[PDB]
Design a protein around this motif. Sequence first.
Motif, PDB file in Angstrom:
ATOM      1  N   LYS A 145     -13.407  60.136  -8.625  1.00 40.22           N
ATOM      2  CA  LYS A 145     -14.442  60.650  -9.101  1.00 40.22           C
ATOM      3  C   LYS A 145     -15.008  60.891 -10.113  1.00 40.22           C
ATOM      4  CE  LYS A 145     -18.080  61.968  -6.578  1.00 40.22           C
ATOM      5  NZ  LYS A 145     -18.235  63.106  -5.799  1.00 40.22           N
ATOM      6  N   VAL A 146     -13.857  61.515 -11.281  1.00 43.09           N
ATOM      7  CA  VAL A 146     -14.168  61.833 -12.624  1.00 43.09           C
ATOM      8  C   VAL A 146     -12.937  62.114 -13.303  1.00 43.09           C
ATOM      9  CG1 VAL A 146     -16.386  62.840 -12.657  1.00 43.09           C
ATOM     10  CG2 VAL A 146     -14.354  64.137 -11.947  1.00 43.09           C
ATOM     11  N   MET A 191     -11.884  65.242 -15.719  1.00 35.78           N
ATOM     12  CA  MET A 191     -12.346  66.429 -16.317  1.00 35.78           C
ATOM     13  C   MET A 191     -11.114  67.501 -16.516  1.00 35.78           C
ATOM     14  SD  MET A 191     -14.760  68.379 -17.400  1.00 35.78           S
ATOM     15  CE  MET A 191     -16.408  67.465 -16.576  1.00 35.78           C
ATOM     16  N   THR A 192     -11.149  68.033 -17.885  1.00 34.17           N
ATOM     17  CA  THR A 192     -10.042  69.100 -18.345  1.00 34.17           C
ATOM     18  C   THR A 192     -10.083  70.292 -17.603  1.00 34.17           C
ATOM     19  OG1 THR A 192     -10.347  68.009 -20.431  1.00 34.17           O
ATOM     20  CG2 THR A 192      -9.498  70.263 -20.164  1.00 34.17           C
ATOM     21  N   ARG A 193      -8.837  70.534 -17.525  1.00 31.14           N
ATOM     22  CA  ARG A 193      -8.562  72.142 -17.178  1.00 31.14           C
ATOM     23  C   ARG A 193      -7.675  72.694 -17.975  1.00 31.14           C
ATOM     24  NH1 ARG A 193      -4.381  74.474 -15.129  1.00 31.14           N
ATOM     25  NH2 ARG A 193      -2.476  72.976 -15.055  1.00 31.14           N
ATOM     26  N   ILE A 194      -7.791  74.121 -18.059  1.00 34.74           N
ATOM     27  CA  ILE A 194      -6.835  74.939 -18.729  1.00 34.74           C
ATOM     28  C   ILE A 194      -5.775  75.277 -17.971  1.00 34.74           C
ATOM     29  CG2 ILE A 194      -8.735  75.649 -20.099  1.00 34.74           C
ATOM     30  CD1 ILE A 194      -7.160  78.344 -18.519  1.00 34.74           C
ATOM     31  N   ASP A 226      -1.290  78.871 -20.640  1.00 29.55           N
ATOM     32  CA  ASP A 226      -1.416  78.710 -21.934  1.00 29.55           C
ATOM     33  C   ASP A 226      -1.933  77.295 -22.322  1.00 29.55           C
ATOM     34  OD1 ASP A 226       0.740  77.520 -20.853  1.00 29.55           O
ATOM     35  OD2 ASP A 226       2.418  78.530 -22.562  1.00 29.55           O
ATOM     36  N   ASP A 227      -0.943  76.339 -22.056  1.00 34.13           N
ATOM     37  CA  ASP A 227      -1.259  74.756 -22.652  1.00 34.13           C
ATOM     38  C   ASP A 227      -2.198  74.236 -21.609  1.00 34.13           C
ATOM     39  OD1 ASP A 227       0.253  74.679 -20.320  1.00 34.13           O
ATOM     40  OD2 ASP A 227       1.541  72.952 -21.243  1.00 34.13           O
ATOM     41  N   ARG A 228      -3.089  73.354 -22.058  1.00 34.97           N
ATOM     42  CA  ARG A 228      -4.069  72.693 -21.652  1.00 34.97           C
ATOM     43  C   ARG A 228      -3.944  71.530 -20.677  1.00 34.97           C
ATOM     44  NH1 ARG A 228      -9.478  70.283 -23.208  1.00 34.97           N
ATOM     45  NH2 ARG A 228      -8.090  69.693 -25.008  1.00 34.97           N
ATOM     46  N   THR A 251     -10.279  64.004 -10.723  1.00 30.22           N
ATOM     47  CA  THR A 251     -10.535  64.895  -9.536  1.00 30.22           C
ATOM     48  C   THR A 251     -10.850  64.001  -8.523  1.00 30.22           C
ATOM     49  OG1 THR A 251     -11.349  66.805 -10.856  1.00 30.22           O
ATOM     50  CG2 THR A 251     -11.988  66.784  -8.530  1.00 30.22           C
ATOM     51  N   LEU A 277     -10.597  67.888  -2.227  1.00 29.97           N
ATOM     52  CA  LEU A 277     -10.360  67.323  -3.479  1.00 29.97           C
ATOM     53  C   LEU A 277      -9.020  67.509  -3.843  1.00 29.97           C
ATOM     54  CD1 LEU A 277     -13.275  69.165  -5.366  1.00 29.97           C
ATOM     55  CD2 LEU A 277     -13.119  66.628  -4.706  1.00 29.97           C
ATOM     56  N   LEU A 299      -6.112  66.917  -7.753  1.00 28.24           N
ATOM     57  CA  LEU A 299      -6.499  66.957  -9.229  1.00 28.24           C
ATOM     58  C   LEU A 299      -4.981  66.433  -9.747  1.00 28.24           C
ATOM     59  CD1 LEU A 299      -8.296  69.231  -8.413  1.00 28.24           C
ATOM     60  CD2 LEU A 299      -7.814  70.156 -10.604  1.00 28.24           C
ATOM     61  N   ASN A 338     -15.620  55.144 -11.855  1.00 26.65           N
ATOM     62  CA  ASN A 338     -15.438  56.445 -10.885  1.00 26.65           C
ATOM     63  C   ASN A 338     -16.505  56.476 -10.345  1.00 26.65           C
ATOM     64  OD1 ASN A 338     -17.062  56.619 -13.153  1.00 26.65           O
ATOM     65  ND2 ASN A 338     -16.436  58.869 -13.711  1.00 26.65           N
ATOM     66  N   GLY A 339     -16.365  56.980  -8.945  1.00 26.68           N
ATOM     67  CA  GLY A 339     -16.977  56.655  -7.648  1.00 26.68           C
ATOM     68  C   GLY A 339     -16.507  55.663  -7.350  1.00 26.68           C
ATOM     69  N   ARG A 392     -20.149  64.079  -8.154  1.00 27.31           N
ATOM     70  CA  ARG A 392     -19.270  64.448  -9.086  1.00 27.31           C
ATOM     71  C   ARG A 392     -19.565  65.701  -9.988  1.00 27.31           C
ATOM     72  NH1 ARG A 392     -21.289  59.604  -9.467  1.00 27.31           N
ATOM     73  NH2 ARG A 392     -19.705  58.877  -8.106  1.00 27.31           N
ATOM     74  N   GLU A 421     -14.408  73.682 -12.082  1.00 26.94           N
ATOM     75  CA  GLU A 421     -14.852  74.524 -13.192  1.00 26.94           C
ATOM     76  C   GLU A 421     -14.967  75.959 -12.839  1.00 26.94           C
ATOM     77  OE1 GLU A 421     -14.397  71.820 -13.470  1.00 26.94           O
ATOM     78  OE2 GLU A 421     -13.202  71.464 -15.265  1.00 26.94           O
ATOM     79  N   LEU A 453     -11.527  78.508 -23.135  1.00 29.23           N
ATOM     80  CA  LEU A 453     -10.105  78.823 -22.715  1.00 29.23           C
ATOM     81  C   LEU A 453      -9.710  79.872 -22.922  1.00 29.23           C
ATOM     82  CD1 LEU A 453      -7.210  76.153 -23.255  1.00 29.23           C
ATOM     83  CD2 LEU A 453      -6.587  78.437 -23.375  1.00 29.23           C
ATOM     84  N   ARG A 488      -0.625  71.978 -28.662  1.00 25.78           N
ATOM     85  CA  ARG A 488      -0.215  72.182 -27.548  1.00 25.78           C
ATOM     86  C   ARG A 488      -1.051  73.427 -27.033  1.00 25.78           C
ATOM     87  NH1 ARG A 488       6.276  72.284 -27.569  1.00 25.78           N
ATOM     88  NH2 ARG A 488       6.710  70.075 -27.934  1.00 25.78           N
ATOM     89  N   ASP A 520      -3.861  74.231 -27.786  1.00 29.31           N
ATOM     90  CA  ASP A 520      -5.025  73.568 -27.370  1.00 29.31           C
ATOM     91  C   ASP A 520      -6.296  73.694 -28.066  1.00 29.31           C
ATOM     92  OD1 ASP A 520      -3.306  71.742 -25.787  1.00 29.31           O
ATOM     93  OD2 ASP A 520      -3.462  72.890 -24.144  1.00 29.31           O
TER      94      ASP A 520
END
Lengths: 57, 117, 206, 117, 122
Positions: free
Chosen positions: C8-9, C11-14, C17-19, C24, C181, C183, C192-193, D3, D11, D82, E71, E73
């Motif tokens: 699908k995509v 896409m970042t997540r946090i 602490d570290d990201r 997805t 979904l 991750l 994507n798609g 999407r 999110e 964040l 890190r 970030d």
Amino acid sequence: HPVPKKKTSKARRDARRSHHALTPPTLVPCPECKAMKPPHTVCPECGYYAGRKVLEV
Amino acid sequence: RHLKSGRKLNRHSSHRLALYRNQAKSLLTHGRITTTVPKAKELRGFVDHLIHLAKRGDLHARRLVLRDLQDVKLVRKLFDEIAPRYRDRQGGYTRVLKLAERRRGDGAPLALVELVE
Amino acid sequence: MKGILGVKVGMTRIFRDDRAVPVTVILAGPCPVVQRRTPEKDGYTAVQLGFLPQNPKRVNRPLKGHFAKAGVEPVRILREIRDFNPEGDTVTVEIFKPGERVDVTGTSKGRGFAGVMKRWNFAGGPDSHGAHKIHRHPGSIGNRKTPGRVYKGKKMAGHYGAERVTVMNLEVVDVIPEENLLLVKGAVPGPNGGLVIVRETKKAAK
Amino acid sequence: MNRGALIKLVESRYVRTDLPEFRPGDTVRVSYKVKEGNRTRIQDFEGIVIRIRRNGFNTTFTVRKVSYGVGVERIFPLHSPLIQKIDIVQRGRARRAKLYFIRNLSDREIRRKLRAD
Amino acid sequence: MIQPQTYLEVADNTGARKIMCIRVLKGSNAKYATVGDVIVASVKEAIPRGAVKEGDVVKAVVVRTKKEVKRPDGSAIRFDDNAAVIINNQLEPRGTRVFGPVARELREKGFMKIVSLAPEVL
RNA sequence: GUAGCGAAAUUCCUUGUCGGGUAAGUUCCGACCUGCACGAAAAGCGUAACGACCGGAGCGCUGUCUCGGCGAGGGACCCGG
RNA sequence: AUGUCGGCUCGUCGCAUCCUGGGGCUGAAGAAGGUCCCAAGGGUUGGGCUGUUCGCCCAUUAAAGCGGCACGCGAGCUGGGUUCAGAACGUCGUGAGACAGUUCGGUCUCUAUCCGCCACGGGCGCAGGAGGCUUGAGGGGGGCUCUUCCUAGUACGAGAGGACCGGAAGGGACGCACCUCUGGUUUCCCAGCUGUCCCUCCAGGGGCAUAAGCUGGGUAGCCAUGUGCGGAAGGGAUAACCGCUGAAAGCAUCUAAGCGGGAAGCCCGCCCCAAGAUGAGGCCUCCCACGGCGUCAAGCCGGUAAGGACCCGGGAAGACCACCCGGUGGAUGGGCCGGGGGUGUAAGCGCCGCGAGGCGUUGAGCCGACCGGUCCCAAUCGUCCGAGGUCUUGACC
């Protein structure tokens, strides 16, 4: 320059030409008059999909 | 390398704009144009826009179509003769029909544009 | 250890602490249209099948080749090895417990006859010191009379996008059963798609 | 559907509201205050006082470089959502022309001109 | 961040606030350089008097004018390239330096001393 | 073979030794004389100005490169003549 | 007519190995070695000088290999060298000239027929017709490695010094992919500006100022300088070597009995292609045995949407064709609409200021591909090929 080195034959030449060739064009009866028509463009005379939008002058 | 995108179109930038605005003048005058297909496709995009602003209806938008076509006789001609003919409909003001007869000596498929009526 | 699904995509997540950086992937819950049992084949293997494209748009050969066990009306019907299927329909509310590991493969983004500068990542002629043929063309490809043949396997201009590609070991940061979904902290090949199938491996002591 | 929607599920879960602090601007002399742990798990509470210089949108954002000639200039993109961030305070008005990338700064810098903006 | 052959500010004791980076120093093959990487380097300018003439001394890069992605970030970057000179193991000859306080460089662990040492203003 | 010059648009052995340059110089600069086979109108030795000369450093700027990326046009590809 | 040094680009190969492994011996305590043996899977950098390969020389590093391959590679580059003509120095020659003596100069033509190669198709076969899904003979890709830390500075040691084994944690190079992040492009998406000419005089616009006038930004995409993984774990058979039992040499001996351990090497394992593998198809579903013409119904026929093709709309598939998804029982293009996302306050009017401008209506306006909706616009109506792609033998009703 980087010239051909010879003929090779009526054969292999005709092999190439062979694989060329070409398709017949598509055609259909007109819904309206008849004739051929490429399967959907507005024909020159009977002249439409629905509602004439051509011709007469 | 190019993969996804759009606006995949021939001639040459500046005179591309010139091409569109030019045929746009033509079509908004005569009411129909006969051209090679790709020119028709993009033309329906652009012209459909301009008539949209034509029903947008006010001083600004008028001076923005003036930002394009630049010809006040055709501008007002449009601007009071046309808009009522679409003062309801939403988009797709244009129409395009592939035509039976490919042209001499250059072999293009042709096409037949006219805004809908 | 399975799931066929449409990428699908990315896409970042946090994370705490570290990201982290999941893509997805959806995983709707395919109907295993066919067991390949093993008397019948070597594999012992599922043939399942995801999203659904309207009943009429169909050759009836699938109508009934799909009708026998019967799921419904779909197209991404692909097969994968070694997985008993206690369920009548997989879903990943528990195919994949989060934080495990996973091995993804899906079709790569196209390129058309992308050239040599692409292909083998290196190349180039020097520019601007002379070039009847500037910068980016392949260098010489053989040697006179060692054989008088290009060595058969070697690198050349080609076509480098339609290929299947896998990406192996990588983290599953989180399943989410509702919309099916998923991750997977990383890359995952595809447009994507686009399309992806997902399974497992990770034995090593590292 | 699709999407954009589902990534706004995802999110909505993490990036969430970035905890509602949604006040960009650009003139914005400002205090961000990151956590940064280090030695002895210590969540020392770093507090930076700086000039927003750009920001880039799309759910996930990045307050872009936030700049400050400590004497040497130091710039600091600082991911807006964040949880690292804790407290934020604009100290400037959201004024001054041209959106973002104000590179007027990255080059010719100098107190005097920035004040001239 | 990258520097194979380069100039680079310095300001410990040091012959200048400028030095030449010769080859960087990690892992045989090398190519580039992060903060905390040692970088052997010649000293293109010599401060009058001073203790570093025109030789070459190993020294750790600090700041980099290049967007290093942390890190935690986020990413510090600053319009400067400034090493600190180092001796043998990994120390400092002078105890003074001009740079912002901050971290990462300590996370490198090799030199907790500098991060102790590097002040505040400027 | 005088004055003047010399590892030289001349020296082979050769990167001759010393010193200056550079992190490192078979290059150039200054000396040394061991002038294989420099030398006084086939001119010697200087020299401000000048050079689409040729050599050597230094800076300013840069895709020359470290490794390349991207975008337009014109050809190339497909159709018709 | 067999274009000759050198560099680039690409290479692959062997071993007489530079490192990485595996082992004997020691004038080996440990560590560091020395030295020979088995070892070709991977790796063998970045510079200064010179035309240079070569060589010294800096910085290191696990190491910084030696060779092939027409002193690999000019129908692919450079041409610095050297072998042209111009010119000068030295010397040789009475002289024109000459010198593996230097010195500065000094046109590199290269549309590919065939082999080979890379991708991609066309016909066709696969002896019922088609629609899907795959195993895998086989073949390719990949195979690198260092550093600190733990058992422990423990064994060894008489200290300084310091391990095997075995377990982690970190990077450097490289390999494959991906846009979220950082970053780069974004030739017309936005704004500003200058000349000038023209729209209508002022305001607001347009063309031209490179094929974007110039400057600031920039979505998507495409990318690196960015992010994720990957190099194995395991197993089998093994080479130097180490053995167990063991004779003929009724002791002894790793030997033809007969068995065992033994490495980055071989095989499998992992990825990837692949049944034109003529020996696949193997499975599954429906078509049928349609009914046709002098029966070997392997001919001629609509049959058969069973299907398929032509045309169309298109496409993070793409040169072409292919592939894939759509054809009105549609959401596939184009548009309108909503969000996104770019720029960064539109003109107009008002008011302020002598005037350039400012301020309010104004995070406004415009908005390319981005994510959805919406039968408004078009993908109307359509013809065309389409059955035996299987046989004698064997069960079997």
